[PDB]
Amino acid sequence: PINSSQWIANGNASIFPDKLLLTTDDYGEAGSVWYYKPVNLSEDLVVEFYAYLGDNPDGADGITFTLQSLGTNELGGTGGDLGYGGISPSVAVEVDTWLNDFDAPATTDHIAIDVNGNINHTYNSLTYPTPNPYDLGNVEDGREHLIKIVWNATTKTLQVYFDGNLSLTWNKDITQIIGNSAYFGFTGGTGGAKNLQYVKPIYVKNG
Numbered sequence: 001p002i003n004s005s006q007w008i009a010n011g012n013a014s015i016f017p018d019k020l021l022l023t024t025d026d027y028g029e030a031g032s033v034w035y036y037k038p039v040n041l042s043e044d045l046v047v048e049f050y051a052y053l054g055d056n057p058d059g060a061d062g063i064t065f066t067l068q069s070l071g072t073n074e075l076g077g078t079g080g081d082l083g084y085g086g087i088s089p090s091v092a093v094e095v096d097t098w099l100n101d102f103d104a105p106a107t108t109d110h111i112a113i114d115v116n117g118n119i120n121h122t123y124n125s126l127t128y129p130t131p132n133p134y135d136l137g138n139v140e141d142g143r144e145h146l147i148k149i150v151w152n153a154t155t156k157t158l159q160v161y162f163d164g165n166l167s168l169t170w171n172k173d174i175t176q177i178i179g180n181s182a183y184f185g186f187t188g189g190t191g192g193a194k195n196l197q198y199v200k201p202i203y204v205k206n207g
């Protein structure tokens with residue numbers, strides 16, 4: 001179901017016939033996979049994918065869905081950077097499976113909106129501002145989780161659904177951060193803790 005010609009893998013990521021592998025269950029990884037054609041953010045964007053965050057609750061570090069207006073070679077930091085930290089201009093939806101000091105006020109595995117490659121939730125909330133991170137409890141349960149991301153180019157809003165539950169919303173015009181055109185894709189990291197991490201894209205609709 002994955003057409004490998006449509007995806008560009010960087011770092012420790014690999015394109016498989018049925019999934020986008022972001023990290024293997026090994027230390028110090030960063031992986032990214034970008035879709036080959038940019039989307040037009042003056043139209044709506046809906047992305048649905050299954051995410052797998054591993055089977056070890058004591059593992060790390062998490063994944064993102066990222067919109068960024070650079071290109072298909074971008075790869076952010078390892079570990080708590082989730083393969084995303086440093087990429088700008090960007091907006092990311094992180095699924096974060098390791099509590100770093102900069103993750104306050106999160107208390108569990110969490111989903112959050114990050115901007116321009118910043119993964120510090122207090123900084124982003126003081127600067128942009130982004131919403132607080134949303135605690136999911138443990139998502140390193142060896143199950144695939146359904147994530148749906150909705151950009152509405154009329155209302156200038158973003159919604160994020162996890163396992164069918166509205167988890168985050170945002171009222172910032174993301175085109176004023178990244179421009180009207182962006183690559184989309186996925187990133188993952190591991191550090192001093194680890195997990196197998198992958199996504200299975202289901203549906204992408206632009207307009």
Ligand SMILES: OC[C@H]1O[C@@H](O)[C@@H](O)[C@@H](O)[C@@H]1O
Nearest residue numbers: 060079080098190191192193
């Ligand atoms: O992997 C979990 C964590 O491990 C620590 O040793 C560092 O690698 C952090 O960057 C990382 O978030």
Ligand SMILES: [Ca+2]
Nearest residue numbers: 080096098100
């Ligand atoms: Ca983290």
Ligand SMILES: [Mn+2]
Nearest residue numbers: 094096103112
């Ligand atoms: Mn986080």
